[PDB]
Amino acid sequence: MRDLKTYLSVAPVASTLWFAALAGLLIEINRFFPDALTFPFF
Amino acid sequence: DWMPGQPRPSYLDGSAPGDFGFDPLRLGEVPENLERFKESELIHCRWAMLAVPGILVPEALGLGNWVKAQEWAALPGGQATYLGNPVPWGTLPTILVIEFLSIAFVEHQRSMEKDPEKKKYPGGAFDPLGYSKDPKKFHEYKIKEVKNGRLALLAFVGICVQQSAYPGTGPLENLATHLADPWHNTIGNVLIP
Amino acid sequence: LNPSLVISLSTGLSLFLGRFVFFNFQRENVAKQGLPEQNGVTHFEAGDTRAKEYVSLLKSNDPVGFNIVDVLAWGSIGHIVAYYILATSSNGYDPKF
Amino acid sequence: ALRFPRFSQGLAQDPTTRRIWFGIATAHDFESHDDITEGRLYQNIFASHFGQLAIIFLWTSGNLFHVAWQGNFEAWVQDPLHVRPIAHAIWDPHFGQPAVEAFTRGGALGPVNIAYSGVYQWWYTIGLRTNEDLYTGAIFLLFLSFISLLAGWLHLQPKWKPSVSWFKNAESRLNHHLSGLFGVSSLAWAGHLVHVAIPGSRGEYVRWNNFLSVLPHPQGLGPLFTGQWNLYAQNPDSSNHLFSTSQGAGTAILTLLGGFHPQTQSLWLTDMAHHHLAIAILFLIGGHMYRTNFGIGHSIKYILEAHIPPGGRLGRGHKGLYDTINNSIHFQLGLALASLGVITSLVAQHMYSLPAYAFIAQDFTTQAALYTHHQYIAGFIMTGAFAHGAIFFIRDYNPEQNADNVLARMLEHKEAIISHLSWASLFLGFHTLGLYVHNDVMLAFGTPEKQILIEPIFAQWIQSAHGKTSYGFDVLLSSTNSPALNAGRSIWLPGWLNAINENSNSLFLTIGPGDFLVHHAIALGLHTTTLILVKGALDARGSKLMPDKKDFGYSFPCDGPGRGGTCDISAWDAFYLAVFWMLNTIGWVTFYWHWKHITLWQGNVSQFNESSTYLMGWLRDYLWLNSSQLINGYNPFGMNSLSVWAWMFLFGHLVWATGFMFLISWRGYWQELIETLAWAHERTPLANLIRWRDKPVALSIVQARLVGLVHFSVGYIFTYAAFLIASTSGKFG
Amino acid sequence: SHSVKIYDTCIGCTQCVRACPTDVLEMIPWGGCKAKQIASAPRTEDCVGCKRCESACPTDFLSVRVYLWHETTRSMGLAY
Amino acid sequence: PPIGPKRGAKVKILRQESYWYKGTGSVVAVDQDPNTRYPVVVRFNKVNYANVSTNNYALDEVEEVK
Amino acid sequence: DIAGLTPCKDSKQFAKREKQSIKKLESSLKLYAPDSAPALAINATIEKTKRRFDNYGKQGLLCGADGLPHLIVSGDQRHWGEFITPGILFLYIAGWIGWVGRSYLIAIRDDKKPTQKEIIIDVPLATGLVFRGFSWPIAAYRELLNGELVAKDV
């Protein structure tokens, strides 16, 4: 468990998880507001 | 002090006439630069003080504003007019050469000095009434001179910026239109169209 | 308008300015700037024979040292300004206010 | 000594073929030659300059002779717009009959080459009309080159060779060059334009045998000395004027109109003569600045040392710079190359937008060739200027004599400069490539409307400020009551505004988002090339990886594999890597220019506007699209006049590709291969009777890099020249 | 013949001498460090310029410096 | 009277051809012996390009800093 | 309008491109069954295209002769939604990222083996640090004014 946590935070694994989360977030934002070329709210 | 609560520059003690410790950019850090700055300031102040009445007095009379009075030179037949009469030698190349020569000679004669106190306060032929007798009364006169000179410089800046704001108008016209309707006619309309 | 009048007047005036007004200033400046030098020695002192200053024609009998080279210089300035005046006065160009 | 090279005793003892190679590649590096002194170096440089002048004169004389001999000048001047100028005849015994048939053009009696240097238009404008004039010019130039060689030889001989003190007299040289080389030369050119070219463009044929009997103006020299100069501009040429005829001709010799000649679409000759006269006056006045033997004027070093700001933000300012510039010849060469490259690029930028030669604006291939020419040469000159700056740092820099001046302070904060320049390059590259890839992906998905098209609004505003009225910005010159507009309404603004708003020339082309993106690509290229060169120069004297680099010379292979490995650590290697980026940047510049102009010449500027925003548009609508006639120059069904380019197009592809060899494969492999080859040759019958005299060896590391770069560059230039000339000439539009 | 120099920062570790693949360097008596040793280069005519000695020097900067110079058949490492 | 900075001190390097030039290191030992021109021994927390963390310096090359 | 462009809402080539895009999309739809999964997907795409074009017309983008939207970045207040407020948003996010990373580097710089916490990210500390990027605009400003943003002695 402790060693699993340690290995699960090593550079490659942490980076892949971070970028998967970022990709999912951006994908969902684009899905809800697609084809957005300007900021119209204000 | 020019700003109650702000520490004063080390090289500006307060002994010089008009010293109020104003030097945010610290241009007078080097003393030999500060001396030249003082002379230049007095020259600018004197020019502005001798000019601003010249900008206002003719305007108060039945002549044009300071910018209309120097527009006749832009015409092929430019000829000057002083106090409502055409001067003979008013054509541009003349006025130009006579002014250039006189000013160059006088400025060179002025610059041929290395006192450097008479550099700023020459005296002699330039003090006929002889106001420089008591050394301390002379100092308060120096303070008054520099104060009025700074005021005149600020006034000239205001005149020029007003002219830019409302082309074809003079300071007295701006004052009159402000007095006609103070609140609505102010700088705000210029700042926020 | 009269080219001879304008040229002569302007040249004489420029010579007067050089001889009586800016004379001492120019002499002081040329004294303090000095001869051009390379590696601390003047051009002649480094072995350049042609760099030698022509001490012969520079001296004059004028009380203050007004010589040939400066008559050439100030007269050239006077003629340049005179012909500028003539050409620009006869050009007929007019800007519009 | 005792063998080639005689200038290097260390090389002459090399028992390998290297001695030959390095013998050729260091012949002009006088400073590294044995028994070299000061006066020897300066005299050799002086004589080599004379040799270069002789070569230049001989080359231009050859151009003249060939155009007069196998040219088309007499026929071309009859109808400049409907006949192709001829460069020189072709005599190739390898040609086949169809090749001879295809290459005979321009009304010649045999195969000939169509000139694209633009010499025909240039010589026509200046006044040359017949073949006799060209022959006389060629003979005069042959005499001139002979005289140049004679001068060089004369100054080689003792008792005529100048001393070093003479070479370092900067004040007098500057005075003479400004007032003499520049001023008097331009005054003479204005004289020729007034006396020959302007009359030539009006019917009269003024030549040596009658130029003293013809007045250039009806009231010759009367107005000039009287001061009433306006009489020389009182009757300009009417707008309905055929060039070399008196129909609609005027009498003005000097003017300032600003437009173009309506028929030739080039600048007025009178305007050009006036320009040259004016700048001649300016140069003559300004060349009296420095002090010589007459006791008046300026001393450059005093001006330099007096320019030190109080407050010490610049340290000691320019103190000591005169001696480091005058004593360092590489500093002088670097400054000269920098200025020359800037003005060569300026020439390139101005020649296409403000043509000065008659009927050259209608010769599209000539315009394209000249622009690409001058831009590539300017890039090479700039790269060389930076190279010689680095060389100066290595060789002629004295740290103690330059203590705390601008140069030393540049050296001591090199890292901030390099890092900030790197940041600028990274920003430009990241965002330019990002926008290009975004647009390309957007068009891949069939949604062009979702692109990021940024209007080059600042450049459009500047164009409006010049007087263009296609963007509706209403600025100076494009407004109505602006002082700038009103001041020049009676001099040049009429013609200038007529020319700029006219949309068939190249005077301030209309610009859009594609122009924005490509200009930012240009900026990226400039910044990255400057990064490489500045980093190579400022780190030439040494860095953290090799602090004692200054003692290893300008160019050396490496410092071995220790300390992590030190490949390409020299300043020479920094220049080496910068040449690739220079080629890439100038390639982008010329791609942009050529595509814009080829789409404008077709009246199809839209097509460029649509397809420039994304890279696939560049790849398909420009490279692939404009490359059909060229590749078809010869095919299984015969050949046409473009075959020679189609061959060159492939030739440039081969050279470039073999350049990749020396750049990828390195020395050790080739050395071992050559060793086994030597064994094999020594072990075979009848051929071991033949013995080499210099031991074969693989090319040096630096030499291999240089050869690879030379192949890369030659292939680059040849393939692009073939493509450009074939595509523009294939359509002639 | 390449030029090999030994600078006074040498600590007499001997690692450069072990590395030379042509026996160019040596150890000589000396008195300015604890080992009383310093490197010498009496046979630079046999130096091939490999710079393998510099890769072994632990001082910063190096105490042994190889400056490539005129090339001979010995320096070029040619067996033919 | 020992010479140079004390053991465990904090010195910055002034040798311009050193990797840690203008850097900082900890003094390890200064030899009391004369006739040695690089007595000071300094240790750094960063290796150089040769992967070495210790070097000797002359007395004037090191400068005790706070 | 600005730079000779015209609003997309009243532009004609923009409408022509919109119609052509919808026509191209519809061309494929007629091939399949009226209410199959491919047909539903194509209908959804057509509706998405219509919504996109209507939104572009609504926001008031500028269209050139090409009929495509163009972005004005000179600073005109009529177009701040095109580059300036997205630019401010990017600057905020990027400064967030950089400040958080710098804070992590400074925090782990005191250990005997800082590199160990660099190849193996100390997530516990990172989770506490990531939230400083909400207020990094103030932290960095006071860091600069206090004079310890930039390493002196260097």
Ligand code: CLA
């Ligand atoms: C297509 C060829 C190519 C490309 C793309 C580059 C690109 C670059 N070169 Mg280079 N160069 C090239 C050929 C090329 N070069 C050649 C043939 C030579 C001759 C040897 C050189 C010699 C050279 C030198 C000497 C230098 C450069 C430098 C640079 C960088 C300049 C900084 C910049 O512009 O920001 C960025 C530019 C980009 C194009 C961004 C690239 C990254 C993008 C965003 C992709 C991101 C990855 C993406 C997420 C996909 C990941 C996939 C996954 C599997 C990992 C840049 C990255 C300079 C430098 O280092 O800058 C300081 C430098 O000094 N080049």
Ligand code: CLA
């Ligand atoms: C050219 C005019 C001029 C000059 C040469 C000086 C020179 C000097 N002033 Mg002074 N001053 C001036 C005008 C000038 N002043 C005006 C108009 C005012 C009223 C606002 C003052 C009010 C003032 C005070 C209260 C004090 C000084 C003081 C000083 C002395 C010390 C400061 C210094 O070293 O800076 C040197 C200054 C300059 C080199 C001029 C700077 C010019 C820069 C390059 C441009 C300025 C930009 C400006 C804002 C443009 C406005 C344009 C318009 C559109 C608004 C020095 C000799 C101090 C002193 O000890 O007196 C002896 C002092 O306390 N001045």
Ligand code: CLA
């Ligand atoms: C007035 C211009 C000028 C002058 C006077 C010099 C003078 C000098 N340069 Mg320099 N240089 C210049 C411009 C100039 N350069 C420019 C524009 C560049 C940018 C490319 C360079 C880049 C440069 C570098 C990198 C170096 C020099 C070096 C030198 C010095 C030795 C050159 C030598 O003898 O090598 C011998 C000459 C050669 C090897 C040239 C033969 C090989 C050429 C490149 C092949 C030509 C192309 C090919 C044959 C054409 C295709 C063939 C066919 C298919 C058509 C010398 C003092 C060298 C030096 O040692 O500095 C001290 C040095 O390393 N220069």
Ligand code: CLA
């Ligand atoms: C267009 C690029 C190019 C070309 C032309 C070559 C050509 C060659 N490579 Mg090569 N290579 C390249 C790219 C290229 N490479 C690159 C980029 C790399 C990096 C990976 C390599 C790495 C590489 C290695 C490692 C090796 C080679 C080898 C060879 C040679 C093989 C021997 C041979 O083919 O016999 C004959 C040569 C040819 C067919 C080439 C064209 C010859 C023409 C047709 C003859 C024209 C003659 C003409 C009449 C001359 C008159 C002109 C006159 C004015 C002088 C050959 C000369 C091998 C080698 O050296 O062989 C032992 C070798 O080991 N290459």
Ligand SMILES: CC1=C(/C=C/C(C)=C/C=C/C(C)=C\C=C/C=C(C)/C=C/C=C(C)/C=C/C2=C(C)CCCC2(C)C)C(C)(C)CCC1
């Ligand atoms: C003796 C004397 C005197 C007098 C004298 C005199 C009077 C003389 C002179 C003189 C002079 C008076 C001189 C002059 C001058 C000089 C010169 C040397 C010059 C010049 C100029 C020039 C050279 C110019 C040119 C030009 C040209 C060609 C181009 C266009 C135009 C111009 C103008 C620019 C007296 C009695 C007083 C006193 C005593 C002494």
Ligand SMILES: CC1=C(/C=C/C(C)=C/C=CC(/C)=C/C=C/C=C(C)/C=C/C=C(C)/C=C/C2=C(C)CCCC2(C)C)C(C)(C)CCC1
């Ligand atoms: C390395 C080095 C070197 C070199 C370097 C270089 C070469 C650099 C550069 C550079 C460059 C090459 C630059 C350029 C520039 C330019 C500029 C800076 C400009 C400008 C501006 C202006 C002044 C403008 C004006 C105007 C007008 C007049 C009007 C119209 C508009 C305009 C705006 C155009 C040397 C050898 C020396 C030394 C060592 C170091």
Ligand SMILES: CC1=C(C/C=C(\C)CCC[C@H](C)CCC[C@H](C)CCCC(C)C)C(=O)c2ccccc2C1=O
């Ligand atoms: C091919 C190759 C060789 C071997 C190259 C050799 C042996 C050159 C052989 C060429 C012969 C001499 C014919 C070349 C023909 C030339 C066109 C003649 C030019 C001579 C003058 C006109 C200048 C290297 O030694 C090498 C070294 C380091 C990196 C890359 C390489 C590399 O790529």
Ligand code: SF4
């Ligand atoms: S370069 Fe190689 S052969 Fe020469 S001394 Fe050093 S280790 Fe020995």
Ligand code: SF4
């Ligand atoms: S490797 Fe360096 S420190 Fe060791 S003995 Fe050789 S020169 Fe001296």
